[PDB]
Amino acid sequence: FNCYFPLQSYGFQPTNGVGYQPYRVVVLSFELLHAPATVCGPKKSTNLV
Amino acid sequence: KNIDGYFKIYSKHTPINLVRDLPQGFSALEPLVDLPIGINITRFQTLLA
Numbered sequence: 001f002n003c004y005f006p007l008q009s010y011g012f013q014p015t016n017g018v019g020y021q022p023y024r025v026v027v028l029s030f031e032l033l034h035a036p037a038t039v040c041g042p043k044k045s046t047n048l049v
Numbered sequence: 050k051n052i053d054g055y056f057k058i059y060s061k062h063t064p065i066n067l068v069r070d071l072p073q074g075f076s077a078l079e080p081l082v083d084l085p086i087g088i089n090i091t092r093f094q095t096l097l098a
Contacts, residue, residue, distance in 0.1 A: 033087075035054055035085075
């Protein structure tokens with residue numbers, strides 16, 4: 001009575017709809033601390049004149 | 050040394066004839082790496098074989 005195993009399995013199935021099929025989610029977190037910058041985007045270049 | 054989070058290292062290699070504690074001469078030390086670690090350091094210690 002009012003005591004249940006909290007974790008529950010999923011119904012990810014081919015029968016499921018768009019709102020119930022699985023979706024591999026990836027949340028990309030970012031950080032801007034006083035520590036130095038360590039990750040940056042790719043830089044471009046060109047030929048040499 | 051470590052300045053503004055960047056840990057810098059300079060070094061070289063040379064032969065000597067260790068007749069005394071140190072030699073009376075001159076030779077410059079080139080840079081090796083520059084790591085943007087970003088921590089505080091106040092102590093150190095050596096490791097031996």
